[PDB]
Design a binder for these strands. Structure first.
Ligand SMILES: [Mn+2]
Ligand SMILES: [Mn+2]
Ligand SMILES: [Mn+2]
Ligand code: NA
Ligand code: NA
Ligand code: NA
Length: 320
DNA sequence: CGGCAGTACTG
DNA sequence: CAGTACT
DNA sequence: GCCG
């Protein structure tokens, strides 16, 4: 990154706006930061800064203060609440509104939350694993987790296909969590397996806590056996084979990549989700779907790219 | 002016 | 529903 | 915050 001396200051503002709930301003900062982290050379001119997509007048100004000053004075007026809001919103299941409410009620530490806050079931689990959920795991451990789920699934039906997605599939050396997609080529025998699969993984002691138990999504907590093991976040999604490519695409990400691809689809009168790529989608003036359109056949990820008019990208080049 | 992705749970 | 989460 |  040609421009760390700027980006590092901007990220502090981005996080501050984010934990305070100012989601769109934070989004603007996030995009400018990436734009600047992928510029070839250092930024040296206000009109060079303004040169970059995702950097406008306000952001060019800030970068000009940074290079002439070495500093950004807005940093000195960030509310004293922000570190605490960040502390609280790093509890799984607590976001900006919950963090702000706890702050308003006088909470300042996780000890305050533990002893005095009313927690949802999810948030109590999040708090119990507060440290573990902030830590990444080696790639090799994600493999063991993927393989544990697959062996449990295949025990019921040898035909079940299980694939670790997320950062694992984008090739990263460490992973924040494990994202396992399950389907079945027969288009049928994925149905109703969660009951048995989760029960099997629980029987082991492998699954330690459940956060979400939906008909198609599971989000929870696992821990491999033996000493030196941390609790890890595990997500499982079960999908019909007709949706495999779009589910794979979704679940592999990155998040920014998905949002970028979905924005593109919208420009073309199409819609892309975890379920399907659709065409002839009808939307209102405000960008909201008011007519569904037609599902397009997407047997493979490459088909989604092709139908969108884009060159295929392997998972590793989707790490946006 | 106003969208900024699209979707799934929770209670 | 608002809130939070997933990529 | 940015951009159409
Ligand atoms: Mn993940
Ligand atoms: Mn995950
Ligand atoms: Mn632990
Ligand atoms: Na620009
Ligand atoms: Na949180
Ligand atoms: Na008190």
């Amino acid at each position: 990154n040609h421009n760390l001396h700027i980006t590092e200051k901007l990220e502090v503002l981005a996080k501050a706006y984010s934990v305070q709930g100012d989601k769109w301003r934070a989004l603007g900062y996030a995009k400018a930061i990436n734009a600047l982290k992928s510029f070839h050379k250092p930024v040296t001119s206000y009109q060079e800064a303004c040169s970059i997509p995702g950097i406008g007048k306000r952001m060019a100004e800030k970068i000009i203060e940074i290079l002439e000053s070495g500093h950004l004075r807005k940093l000195d007026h960030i509310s004293e609440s922000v570190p605490v809001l960040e502390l609280f919103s790093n509890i799984w299941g607590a976001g900006t509104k919950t963090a702000q409410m706890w702050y308003q009620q006088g909470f300042r530490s996780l000890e305050d939350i533990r002893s005095q806050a009313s927690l949802t079931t999810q948030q109590a689990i999040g708090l119990k694993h507060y440290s573990d959920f902030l830590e990444r795991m080696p790639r090799e451990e994600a493999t063991e987790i993927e393989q544990t789920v697959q062996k449990a699934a295949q025990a019921f039906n040898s035909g079940l296909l299980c694939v670790a997605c997320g950062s694992y599939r984008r090739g990263k050396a460490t992973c924040g969590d494990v994202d396992v997609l399950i389907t079945h080529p027969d288009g049928r025998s994925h149905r109703g397996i969660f009951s048995r699969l989760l029960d099997s993984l629980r029987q082991e002691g492998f699954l330690t806590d459940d956060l979400v138990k939906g008909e198609t999504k599971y989000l929870g907590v696992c821990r491999l056996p033996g000493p030196g093991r941390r609790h890890r976040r595990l997500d499982i999604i079960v999908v019909p084979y007709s949706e495999f490519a779009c589910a794979l695409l979704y679940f592999t990400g990155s998040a920014h990549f998905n949002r970028s691809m979905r924005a593109l689809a919208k420009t073309k009168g199409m819609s892309l989700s975890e379920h399907a790529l659709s065409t002839a989608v009808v939307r209102n003036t405000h960008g909201a779907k008011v007519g569904p359109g037609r599902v397009l056949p997407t047997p493979t990820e490459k088909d989604v790219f092709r139908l969108l008019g884009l060159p295929y990208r392997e998972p590793a080049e989707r790490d946006w």
